[PDB]
Structure 1
Amino acid sequence: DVVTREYTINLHKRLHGVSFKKRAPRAVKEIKKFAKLHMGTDDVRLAPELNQAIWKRGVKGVEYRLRLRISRKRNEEEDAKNPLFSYVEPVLVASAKGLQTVVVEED
């Protein structure tokens, strides 16, 4: 069921009390588990444009909130996973405050 939504994600309440050499690698696993709860599929592809958006202030300077776009897509034949997977990509905004989940229309 191809659905594209918007989200924020509160990383300050997820990276609370982590070693500094493991903050930015932990924030990658958190977004995969966050997409698994909402979109309900296991394998999540993070775009490399989002990988820049986590590691931009070093390993220990991960931002508090990010603003995500998560699309759930059809998968190709003879994949043993599923017909479904997610593709998380970032949307760039002035500040990530005061936003809420909005469905993005299709065209």
Structure 2
Amino acid sequence: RKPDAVSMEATIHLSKLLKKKTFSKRAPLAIKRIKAFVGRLMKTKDNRIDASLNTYIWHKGVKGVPGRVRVLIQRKSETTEGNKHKHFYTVISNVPVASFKGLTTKTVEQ
């Protein structure tokens, strides 16, 4: 059982998720894909995009969105006081990298 507070980084292949999507929807829809992509592998809701990852998706505008992204994913544990069940959340942040080829996915041992 992998612990709480695990930080791993991975490539999302965005070009396949956005294929044939209406241009005016590319950037805003690419974010819902990353929250849904990260969300299901970390198995949390409330996935949070840093400015570093937001601006990377938008820097070419709404139409052109980069075909791939490396993201660093830090889950942490925070619950409000009187909740019955634990509440996690993740911080998805960009990791600028020149190439992509060869990188795969690996957990940062922190």
Provide the TM-score with structure 2 as the length reference: 0.89
Cα distance in 2 for residues equivalent to 1:50 and 1:79: 32
**2:98 equivalent to 1:91:** no
**2:20 equivalent to 1:17:** yes
Q: 2:49 aligns with which of 34, 38, 46?
A: 46
Runs of 4+ in 1 over 2 A off after TM superposition: 76-83
Cα distance in 2 for residues equivalent to 1:79 and 1:92: 39
Q: 2:105 aligns with which of 90, 101, 106?
A: 101
Provide the TM-score with structure 1 as the length reference: 0.91
Counterpart residue number, 2:74: 71
Residue range with higher mean Cα deviation, 21-30 or 67-76: 67-76
SS at match of 1:12: coil
Cα distance in 2 for residues equivalent to 1:3 and 1:70: 8
SS at match of 2:108: coil
Structure 1: state its 5+ residue gaps: none
Cα distance in 1 for residues equivalent to 2:38 and 2:45: 8
The Cα offsets for residues 4-63 of structure 1, whole Å up to 9 and x where unpaired, read as 001000001100111110001100100000011110001101111111100011111101
Structure 2: state its 5+ residue gaps: none
1:79 and 1:87, CA in 2 relative to 1: closer, same or farther beyond 3 A? farther
Give the share of equivalent positions with the same residue, in percent.
44
Letter in 2 for 1:77: T
Structural RMSD (CA): 1.6
SS at match of 1:57: coil
The Cα offsets for residues 80-100 of structure 1, whole Å up to 9 and x where unpaired, read as 584311110011111222211
Cα distance in 1 for residues equivalent to 2:107 and 2:35: 20
In the alignment of these two chains, the number of paired residues is 106
1:22 and 1:79, CA in 2 relative to 1: closer, same or farther beyond 3 A? farther
